[PDB]
Paper text:
In this study, we used single-cell sequencing technology to isolate hundreds of monoclonal antibodies from convalescent patients of BA.1 breakthrough infection and identified dozens of elite antibodies with NT50 values at the picomolar level. To further analyze the molecular basis for these elite nAbs, we determined the structure of Fab in complex with Omicron BA.4/5 S-trimers by cryo-EM combined with X-ray crystallography. Next, we evaluated the epitopes of these elite antibodies and found that these antibodies mainly fall into two distinct groups, which was consistent with the results of the epitope competition assay.
These antibodies, which are similar to the IGHV2–5 germline-derived LY-CoV140415 and XGv26526, target the conserved solvent-exposed outer face of the SARS-CoV-2 RBD without directly blocking the binding of ACE2 and can be categorized into the RBD-5 community.
Residue numbers in the entry:
A (entry chain N): 2 to 111
B (entry chain C): 27 to 70, 80 to 142, 157 to 176, 187 to 210, 215 to 397
C (entry chain C): 596 to 620, 641 to 644
D (entry chain B): 348 to 595
E (entry chain O): 1 to 125
F (entry chain A): 497 to 545
G (entry chain A): 398 to 446
């Protein structure tokens, strides 16, 4: 039981991106407690969104999470520069092991 | 010391208006003609006084020498003590479990340890002046009544009004007062020297559960009261529900000698059950052919078991062992 | 029972315990 | 919170509507003692409290007026004159893990039972007929708290149950929280049906001439007849007289 | 504002043991549910263990089960994680993270906001 | 309705029976029979209930 | 009479008994006489989704 997160994406300033994050019917689907974090090289990964529609402080509205059945999907708008970083989708589960993680996404801007 | 409290301490108990009628109510009042402990406010500054059940606190001063209170169950920060502090501007009420020093600080405005406050409240201040106060804390509430009158406790009758009712739920057991002094130094600890102050003194009185017959006048104010349980004449007034009794003989109540002891008599505990016969067995059976024995129709006691066996494991499901000596069962198996 | 000569005459009072004798309660039998 | 440290929160000075509660939680049990819920939307109350905690599923019954068991002896107990409502909804989907959720515990051993609505959180090891073990456990001297260890396969009566209790007085003390119902313009000198802050009756309303003290809210004649009342909006005092009647 | 600094990691040999210290600043570690996040080199993040605020609920990672004990020093106001009987496959970086909804009336799902600075561990010859 | 909710949220098919008992003209009742009529004697009778 | 209702409301089906099922939904008189029957049916009326 791990989330499957894709490799990497690429686009130019002005475009908007999406990233898929699946799971089983016990971690993501059935609890809607899933979250998304970002990591610049050399710093502890930082939270981007959780509670899918609940965007936390400071975050630019350019990110939009959504959860449909089991799949989850992030959507980032307005390609800027700071985007160079990893993105991990996490979720709260219900059996042993209270958190699993996605493979990680690399978002690079041209 | 001691001094009898005259006919004082009556207060409006239910804040519902009533006019020109007599009403009997059972509540915590100050029994009439009872003596009350007296302490003085010069220096040692004030000894601790218990909050048994309720305090009738009167103070006669004209220079604001008495300025506040501190209440609570202990001086350590382990419990939510209370603060009531008057000032020329306002009262400050706090419930914050602040650890206190060996003596209450003399207002150089504060001397106390840290706080973990849970409730706070503020309002207008409590300010020849006869100050009377009644504090009661029974029902999860701390209640204040008060009255300030021109002018020993006077014999004139006058009732107290409910001013504020604090829902704070601290378990209150001791209470102390707070003093002040002009151009006085303040330190956590001082001797019995104290500082000079104006001539003043303060009395303390204790409430008790009593039945009072209150007389309301045509304007809705209490003007007289008779303590229903003081002496035979008051008890007769209270039974006729009338302040004037005419000549005659009246049957007021009944008396009944109370039981002085309790005794239980049962048969001498006799036909025991065979327990030191199952634990002390010399040779056991195997697991796959375990042995069961029905034990019934006898008096079983599970207090003798602690002797035998260091008892690496002794546990019960559905019952607790301390209560097991009590219930009666159908048929117990082993 | 309470014996009273009247509120307007005086407050003195005498008390009558009906079914008991004071040896197991001035005194008068 | 856990049963042995239930949490209390005071809610007052607001407009309360008890029609939205039907939403949250399938509500296996929602019952009231002293009021009936369909009418609950109308009255005004003194001070309403809310207590929340988690208990086992065979003990919900223990939360009742004056019922004995082991969840209302030393854990949490409500009074015998309780008034209010109790609410429970089976929540076995967020509080029970695989292996035992050792997160909620309850006092199994207590010296003496507890008065209504007090909670004790001191951790102390039970005694055993001798100076109590100072840190250890023998035949007795057990740990006061025993974990529930909730698991997702138990029978429903052992699955945990979130519960929340509302408790409030109705002596018509100064209203602090009422139901939605809107106000209406005042009429004087006519036999009219009135509903003053929860107090319902009939009679003619007249400007009063008696001096209410500022801390008072109701007025009474002999025999509990509500004789006067102060307006909850403009604070003018009003007298009540039942309209004319007689025999024919 | 709130920092979570670590100390105690570095190089080690296989078979030995070690102790990690998580120092909380900016708030009180004595009432905030914690859990550690480890990240092997070139992979994602992984759950390690979890302490509750109560102190009576402890949930370990399934692979490190049987070892990797956790505790809190409410006197020195730190978190300690002792890694015991390490193996070669355990080389990774470790993070000490705090759960956000530590109040009592939040109505908001969990989310790890304050992260630990993180230290790496290398176990080999 | 979904098949996994708590007991308080699953459906219940329901049917309600309603009937008068003013002993109005009997329309339904079988579990017995009838007996020959008896006259002039103290007898316990059961007329349609 | 037949219809389908929830599993926490069985108590609500009574003459003038409060909950949210016997005031404005469908109501029986205050002098009702008869019997009531309900059975949770989740095997023939609840689909997936
Ligand atoms: C003996 C005792 O409880 N002392 C308290 C402590 O528990 C609490 O943590 C602190 C606030 O930081 O205030 C003090
Ligand atoms: C209910 C309660 O807390 N009562 C306390 C009691 O426990 C304590 O022993 C006593 C003073 O010792 O003061 C009072
Ligand atoms: C007999 C009596 O006390 N009558 C009082 C009067 O003295 C007072 O002046 C008035 C209010 O001012 O209320 C009435
Ligand atoms: C000593 C004393 O109280 N005497 C009273 C008197 O004052 C009163 O006028 C009379 C009734 O008219 O009853 C007697
Ligand atoms: C004044 C007095 O004592 N009266 C009687 C006494 O004579 C009697 O002996 C006693 C019981 O025996 O009861 C009483």
């Amino acid at each position: 039981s791990a989330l499957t997160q894709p490799a990497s994406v690429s686009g130019s300033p002005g475009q908007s991106i999406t990233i898929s994050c699946t799971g089983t019917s016990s971690d993501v689907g059935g609890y809607n407690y899933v979250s998304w974090y970002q990591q610049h090289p050399g710093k502890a990964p930082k939270l981007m969104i959780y509670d899918v529609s609940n965007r936390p402080s400071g975050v630019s509205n350019r990110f939009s999470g959504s959860k449909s059945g089991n799949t989850a999907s992030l959507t980032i708008s307005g390609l800027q520069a700071e985007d160079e970083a990893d993105y991990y989708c996490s979720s709260y589960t219900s059996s042993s092991t209270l958190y699993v993680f996605g493979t990680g996404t690399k978002v690079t801007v041209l | 010391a001691y001094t009898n409290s005259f006919t004082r301490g009556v207060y409006y108990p239910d804040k519902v208006f009533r006019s020109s009628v007599l009403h009997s109510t059972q509540d915590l009042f100050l029994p009439f003609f009872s003596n009350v402990t007296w302490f003085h406010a010069i220096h040692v500054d004030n000894p601790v006084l218990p909050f048994n059940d309720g305090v009738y606190f009167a103070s006669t001063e004209k220079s604001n020498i008495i300025r506040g209170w501190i209440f609570g169950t202990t001086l350590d920060s382990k419990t939510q003590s209370l603060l009531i502090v008057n000032n020329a501007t306002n009262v400050v009420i706090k419930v914050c479990e602040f650890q206190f020093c060996n003596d209450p600080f003399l207002d150089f405005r504060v001397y106390s340890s840290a706080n973990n406050c849970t409730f706070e409240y503020v309002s207008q201040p409590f300010l020849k002046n006869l100050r009377e106060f009644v504090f009661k804390n029974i029902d999860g509430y701390f209640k204040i009544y008060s009255k300030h009158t021109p002018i020993d406790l006077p014999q004139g009758f006058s009732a107290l009004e409910p001013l504020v009712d604090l829902p704070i739920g601290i378990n209150i057991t001791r209470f102390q007062t707070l003093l002040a002094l002009h151009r006085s130094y303040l330190t956590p600890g001082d001797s019995s020297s104290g500082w000079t102050a104006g001539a003043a003194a303060y009395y303390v009185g204790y409430l008790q559960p009593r039945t009072f017959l209150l007389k309301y006048n045509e304007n809705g104010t209490i003007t007289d009261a008779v303590d229903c349980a003081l002496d035979p004449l008051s008890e007769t007034k209270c039974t006729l529900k009338s302040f004037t009794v005419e000549k005659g003989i009246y049957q007021t109540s009944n008396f009944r000698v109370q039981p002085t002891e309790s005794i239980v008599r049962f048969p001498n505990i006799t036909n025991l059950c065979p327990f030191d016969e199952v634990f002390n067995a010399t040779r056991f059976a195997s697991v796959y052919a375990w042995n069961r024995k029905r034990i019934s129709n006898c008096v079983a006691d599970y207090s003798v078991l602690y002797n035998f066996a260091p008892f690496f494991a002794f546990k019960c499901y559905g019952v607790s062992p301390t209560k097991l000596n009590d219930l009666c069962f159908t048929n117990v198996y082993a | 029972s309470v014996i009273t000569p009247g509120t307007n005459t005086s407050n003195q009072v005498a008390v009558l315990y009906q079914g008991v004798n004071c040896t197991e309660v001035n005194v008068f039998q | 919170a856990s049963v042995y440290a239930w949490n209390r929160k005071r809610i007052s000075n607001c407009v309360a509507d008890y029609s939205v509660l039907y939403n949250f939680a399938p509500f296996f049990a929602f019952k009231c003692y002293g009021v009936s819920p369909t009418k609950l939307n109308d009255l005004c109350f003194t001070n309403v409290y809310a207590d929340s905690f988690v208990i086992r599923g065979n003990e919900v019954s223990q939360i009742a007026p004056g019922q004995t068991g082991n969840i209302a002896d030393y854990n949490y107990k409500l009074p015998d004159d309780f008034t209010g409502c109790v609410i429970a909804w089976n929540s076995n989907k967020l509080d029970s893990k695989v292996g035992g959720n050792y997160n909620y515990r309850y006092r199994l051993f207590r010296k003496s039972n507890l008065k209504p609505f007090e909670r004790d959180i001191s951790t102390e090891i039970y005694q055993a007929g001798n100076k109590p073990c100072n840190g250890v456990a023998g035949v007795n001297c057990y740990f006061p708290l025993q974990s529930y260890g909730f698991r997702p396969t138990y029978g429903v009566g052992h699955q945990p149950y979130r519960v929340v209790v509302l408790s409030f007085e109705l002596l018509h003390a100064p209203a602090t929280v009422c139901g939605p119902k809107k106000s209406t313009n005042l009429v004087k000198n006519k036999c009219v049906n009135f509903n003053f802050n929860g107090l319902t009756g009939t009679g003619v309303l007249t400007e009063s001439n008696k001096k209410f003290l500022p801390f008072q809210q109701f007025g009474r004649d002999i025999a509990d007849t509500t004789d006067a009342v102060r307006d909850p909006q403009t604070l003018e005092i009003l007298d009540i007289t039942p309209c004319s009647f007689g025999g024919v | 504002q709130v920092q979570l600094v670590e100390s105690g990691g570095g190089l080690v040999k296989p078979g030995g043991s070690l102790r990690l210290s998580c120092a909380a600043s900016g708030f009180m570690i004595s009432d905030s549910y914690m859990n550690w996040i480890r990240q092997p080199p070139g992979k994602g993040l992984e759950w390690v263990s979890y302490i509750s605020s109560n102190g009576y609920a402890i949930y370990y990672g399934d692979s490190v089960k049987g070892r990797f004990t956790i505790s809190r020093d409410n006197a020195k106001n730190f978190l300690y994680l002792q890694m015991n009987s390490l193996r070669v496959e355990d080389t990774a970086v470790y993070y000490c993270a705090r759960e956000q909804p530590g109040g009592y009336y939040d109505s908001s799902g969990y989310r790890l906001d304050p992260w630990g600075q993180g230290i790496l561990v290398t176990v080999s010859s």
